[PDB]
Amino acid sequence: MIQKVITVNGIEQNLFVDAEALLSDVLRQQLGLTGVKVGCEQGQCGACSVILDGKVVRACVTKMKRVADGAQITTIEGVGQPENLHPLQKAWVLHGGAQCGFCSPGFIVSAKGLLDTNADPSREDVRDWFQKHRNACRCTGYKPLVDAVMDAAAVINGKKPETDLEFKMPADGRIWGSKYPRPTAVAKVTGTLDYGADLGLKMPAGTLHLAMVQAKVSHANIKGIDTSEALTMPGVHSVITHKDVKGKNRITGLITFPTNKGDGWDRPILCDEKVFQYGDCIALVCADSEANARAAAEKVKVDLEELPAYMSGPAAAAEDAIEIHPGTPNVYFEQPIVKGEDTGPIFASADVTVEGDFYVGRQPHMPIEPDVAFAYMGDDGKCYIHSKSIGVHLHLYMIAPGVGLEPDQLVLVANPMGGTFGYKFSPTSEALVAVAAMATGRPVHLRYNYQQQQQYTGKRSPWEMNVKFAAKKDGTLLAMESDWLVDHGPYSEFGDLLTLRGAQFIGAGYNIPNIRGLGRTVATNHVWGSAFRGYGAPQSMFASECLMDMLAEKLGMDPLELRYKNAYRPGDTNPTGQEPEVFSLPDMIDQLRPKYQAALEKAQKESTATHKKGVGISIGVYGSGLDGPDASEAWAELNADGTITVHTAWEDHGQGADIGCVGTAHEALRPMGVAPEKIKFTWPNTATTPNSGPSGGSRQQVMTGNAIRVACENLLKACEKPGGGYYTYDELKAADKPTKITGNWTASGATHCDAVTGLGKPFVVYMYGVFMAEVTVDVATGQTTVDGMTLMADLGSLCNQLATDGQIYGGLAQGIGLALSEDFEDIKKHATLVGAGFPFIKQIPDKLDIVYVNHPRPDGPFGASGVGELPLTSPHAAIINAIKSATGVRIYRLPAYPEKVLEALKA
Numbered sequence: 001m002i003q004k005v006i007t008v009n010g011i012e013q014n015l016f017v018d019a020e021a022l023l024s025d026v027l028r029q030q031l032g033l034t035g036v037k038v039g040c041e042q043g044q045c046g047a048c049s050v051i052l053d054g055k056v057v058r059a060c061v062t063k064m065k066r067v068a069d070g071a072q073i074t075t076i077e078g079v080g081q082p083e084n085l086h087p088l089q090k091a092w093v094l095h096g097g098a099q100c101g102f103c104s105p106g107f108i109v110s111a112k113g114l115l116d117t118n119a120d121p122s123r124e125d126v127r128d129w130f131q132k133h134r135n136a137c138r139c140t141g142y143k144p145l146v147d148a149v150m151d152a153a154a155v156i157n158g159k160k161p162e163t164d165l166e167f168k169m170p171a172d173g174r175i176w177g178s179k180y181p182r183p184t185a186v187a188k189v190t191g192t193l194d195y196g197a198d199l200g201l202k203m204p205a206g207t208l209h210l211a212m213v214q215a216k217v218s219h220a221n222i223k224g225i226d227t228s229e230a231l232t233m234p235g236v237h238s239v240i241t242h243k244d245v246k247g248k249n250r251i252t253g254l255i256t257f258p259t260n261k262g263d264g265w266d267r268p269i270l271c272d273e274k275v276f277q278y279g280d281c282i283a284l285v286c287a288d289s290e291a292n293a294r295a296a297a298e299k300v301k302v303d304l305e306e307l308p309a310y311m312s313g314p315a316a317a318a319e320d321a322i323e324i325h326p327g328t329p330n331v332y333f334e335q336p337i338v339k340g341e342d343t344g345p346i347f348a349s350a351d352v353t354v355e356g357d358f359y360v361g362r363q364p365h366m367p368i369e370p371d372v373a374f375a376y377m378g379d380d381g382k383c384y385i386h387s388k389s390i391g392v393h394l395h396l397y398m399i400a401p402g403v404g405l406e407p408d409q410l411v412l413v414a415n416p417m418g419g420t421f422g423y424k425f426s427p428t429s430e431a432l433v434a435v436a437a438m439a440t441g442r443p444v445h446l447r448y449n450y451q452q453q454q455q456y457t458g459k460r461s462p463w464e465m466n467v468k469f470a471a472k473k474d475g476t477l478l479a480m481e482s483d484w485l486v487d488h489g490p491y492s493e494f495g496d497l498l499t500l501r502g503a504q505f506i507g508a509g510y511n512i513p514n515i516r517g518l519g520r521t522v523a524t525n526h527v528w529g530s531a532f533r534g535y536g537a538p539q540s541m542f543a544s545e546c547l548m549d550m551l552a553e554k555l556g557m558d559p560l561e562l563r564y565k566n567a568y569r570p571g572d573t574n575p576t577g578q579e580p581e582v583f584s585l586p587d588m589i590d591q592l593r594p595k596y597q598a599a600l601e602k603a604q605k606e607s608t609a610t611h612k613k614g615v616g617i618s619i620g621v622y623g624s625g626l627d628g629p630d631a632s633e634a635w636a637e638l639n640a641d642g643t644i645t646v647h648t649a650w651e652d653h654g655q656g657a658d659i660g661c662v663g664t665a666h667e668a669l670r671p672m673g674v675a676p677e678k679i680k681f682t683w684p685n686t687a688t689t690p691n692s693g694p695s696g697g698s699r700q701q702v703m704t705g706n707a708i709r710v711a712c713e714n715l716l717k718a719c720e721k722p723g724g725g726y727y728t729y730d731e732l733k734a735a736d737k738p739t740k741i742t743g744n745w746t747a748s749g750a751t752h753c754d755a756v757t758g759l760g761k762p763f764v765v766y767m768y769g770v771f772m773a774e775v776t777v778d779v780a781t782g783q784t785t786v787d788g789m790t791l792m793a794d795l796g797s798l799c800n801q802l803a804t805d806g807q808i809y810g811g812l813a814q815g816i817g818l819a820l821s822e823d824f825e826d827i828k829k830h831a832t833l834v835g836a837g838f839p840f841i842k843q844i845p846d847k848l849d850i851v852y853v854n855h856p857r858p859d860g861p862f863g864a865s866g867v868g869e870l871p872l873t874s875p876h877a878a879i880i881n882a883i884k885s886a887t888g889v890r891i892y893r894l895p896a897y898p899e900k901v902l903e904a905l906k907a
């Protein structure tokens with residue numbers, strides 16, 4: 001050990017450290033500076049950026065021996081605090097750069113390092129800086145971050161007053177539709193919002209820290225577990241196995257479809273008889289620290305008989321394949337789509353037909369914050385779980401029978417969280433921590449490292465797809481045929497539903513009177529499927545939107561004009577036979593057309609012999625809601641101090657549940673003139689907030705937005721004075737009148753899609769968009785650079801533009817990753833951010849352009865649709881279409897790795 005006397009955030013610290021210790025650990029654990037965020041732990045994400053003697057360094061890869069006596073360190077806590085914000089922090093808030101907020105301290109610290117060396121950077125300078133310093137963001141698509149740095153620099157340089165970094169009310173006083181900052185922004189930019197791992201460091205002594213004993217093979221029969229060595233290791237309390245589980249030790253898929261051949265109880269909590277995928281948790285070591293628990297977990301011996309594993313859908317779906325879940329066929333669900341007339345004779349007589357085989361793979365969510373959760377036994381006797389769940393009520397029911405608790409005896413709470421992009425539509429660690437808290441009676445905390453985040457949380461499910469179009473010479477679509485195989489890994493939860501998405505979204509956007517198709521779901525031993533933003537659309541629409549360009553090519557028609565010819569218009573129906581609720585695609589195409597023409601001309605003009613430029617188009621469509629008559633609830637409460645709390649379980653992945661609530665409530669409450677700062681939101685809690693539903697299916701703005709609106713309307717009625725005006729809290733209380741008022745809303749016109757035909761009216765609100773990708777392909781290397789993305793977006797009406805701009809930029813960036821670099825195919829190689837193709841800043845163009853063409857929705861609150869998943873529906877199709885435009889080569893199977901593109905170029 002050594003004494004190190006240094007300065008941290010301007011204060012002399014008399015430090016006692018191990019020379020080998022990581023600066024991140026010292027700062028977080030020894031000094032309580034939890035504003036230093038840790039994600040990847042491998043120097044790849046920059047979340048732990050600190051300034052050390054004028055240089056921006058990643059604290060997770062900086063050992064204390066590299067910290068000189070007398071060194072100066074700055075963390076986010078030293079940059080500024082609430083009530084004392086630095087221009088960079090104010091700018092982040094103004095520009096909405098804090099979505100989940102997990103990368104915000106690291107970006108801001110890094111940015112301060114930049115500005116201290118280059119006071120007046122170009123946008124390009126800012127981008128080069130964040131690239132060099134590995135500052136990664138999964139939420140924002142980077143553009144808002146650069147915006148923020150530029151604005152802060154101008155203030156620091158005296159070129160504009162600091163007061164211009166403060167939001168100015170539109171007054172009208174209307175915050176709906178505005179850039180009003182989100183309530184959580186200040187905490188995020190100051191590092192004072194405690195995420196799951198931060199909470200773990202601030203839990204009491206006697207909290208047990210867990211480590212998972214995980215399967216190191218993909219498929220096995222388990223014979224036994226030997227914990228003897230682990231029990232003797234430092235700090236070890238106990239080891240938990242399936243034997244300690246007090247319930248069924250299974251998670252239920254809960255809404256498993258009746259025609260599913262599986263019962264939906266296939267997923268264990270702790271493996272008992274079988275390993276079903278690499279990473280499966282077989283035991284939990286409870287220890288006094290994460291380090292001690294992990295060390296001991298390595299010594300737990302699992303005796304197993306490895307079995308042949310099926311590592312892809314086609315492999316598992318073979319007629320001969322052995323049942324992974326004995327008693328259930330590997331292909332456990334099929335969804336037909338049967339619209340209009342038989343397609344066979346139509347294809348036979350059509351002027352033109354086209355067909356393609358396409359593949360979209362096992363995209364990893366890659367939030368900067370790896371999975372984390374904790375649990376404890378309350379003094380009330382209930383088991384409390386605090387995690388990254390984005391469906392607290394859903395998860396409660398999915399796990400309660402497995403852990404052996406009645407619904408009333410379990411409470412799930414959503415911690416502030418550093419992104420999920422859908423992986424948290426699934427339980428991950430919740431049942432594990434519950435089991436351990438119940439068994440030990442003590443608080444337990446479980447943090448996954450980045451490898452565990454990659455290998456052992458769910459993934460976008462790969463789809464192998466064949467899609468066909470028949471059309472007239474004039475481009476009119478006559479018929480479509482479709483076949484898709486969904487590789488859902490070993491756990492069935494929502495796999496059937498994902499498969500149904502193919503019936504709803506393959507070929508969405510156009511009038512197609514006649515459809516015959518069949519989706520199939522298959523269990524495999526690759527990673528289990530969890531929702532990934534777009535949930536079936538990124539697969540479905542990659543196929544159909546690529547196929548539309550092939551159709552255009554075959555007709556000798558411009559691909560945008562082919563879409564214009566076919567796009568939804570009054571009278572048309574979508575693939576499930578339902579009338580669209582608005583008709584905005586022709587409008588969007590018409591407004592995009594000149595920008596498209598200009599982009600083509602620029603592409604031709606600026607292409608060289610070695611660097612070929614192209615422009616590609618696609619349409620995206622997706623529902624806002626879960627299928628059928630989805631519903632939400634909110635409570636609007638006048639408090640004693642005149643503030644108003646809007647209680648919901650609107651779960652915040654980081655998308656903006658806070659500002660969604662505040663903005664929607666503010667608009668609903670206008671008659672009573674309620675200032676936005678007086679409106680409070682509630683963190684999701686299954687005991688104390690209503691069942692607003694999960695933040696999945698881009699549904700909360702519509703469902704919970706409506707519920708909030710209704711509740712606020714009902715509060716207004718509760719407060720109304722006879723003769724005009726409104727009663728105060730004290731007045732209502734004096735009259736023994738209610739102050740906490742419920743609102744409910746249901747999408748009553750929606751129906752579930754049929755099990756035989758796929759027909760129905762699954763959502764009452766959809767999101768519609770038109771993408772344009774501009775790319776350059778280096779034909780010597782096969783490397784594609786996305787130089788620009790445009791999204792024409794119909795969101796009905798914007799609750800908040802900082803929120804919606806950010807959502808779209810974030811989705812577009814994930815589109816670039818899905819198109820060019822991302823996958824989780826190799827269990828080891830893809831278990832890091834860099835290995836799995838995470839888009840760093842230079843991979844995302846600065847030119848991300850949005851045009852809102854909003855057609856107010858009959859059923860959305862104040863006309864709003866959702867936005868969440870729209871930007872990831874088909875941007876990767878636009879990009880692939882752009883590569884085709886540039887070079888003449890079509891990539892059918894994502895991602896377009898350079899070697900893959902080169903092989904196609906040279907073929």
Ligand code: FES
Pocket residue numbers: 037038039040041042043044045046047048049058059060061
């Ligand atoms: S670079 Fe340190 S946590 Fe990712």
Ligand code: FES
Pocket residue numbers: 097098099100101102103104136137138139140368418419654
């Ligand atoms: S705001 Fe950057 S990772 Fe979420």
Ligand SMILES: [Cl-]
Pocket residue numbers: 459460461498530531532533534535536
């Ligand atoms: Cl998906």
Ligand SMILES: [Cl-]
Pocket residue numbers: 890891892893894
């Ligand atoms: Cl290909």
Ligand SMILES: [Cl-]
Pocket residue numbers: 897898899900
């Ligand atoms: Cl390659």
Ligand SMILES: [Mg+2]
Pocket residue numbers: 085086087
């Ligand atoms: Mg200042």
Ligand SMILES: [Mg+2]
Pocket residue numbers: 511
């Ligand atoms: Mg017609």
Ligand SMILES: [Mg+2]
Pocket residue numbers: 899903
């Ligand atoms: Mg090769």
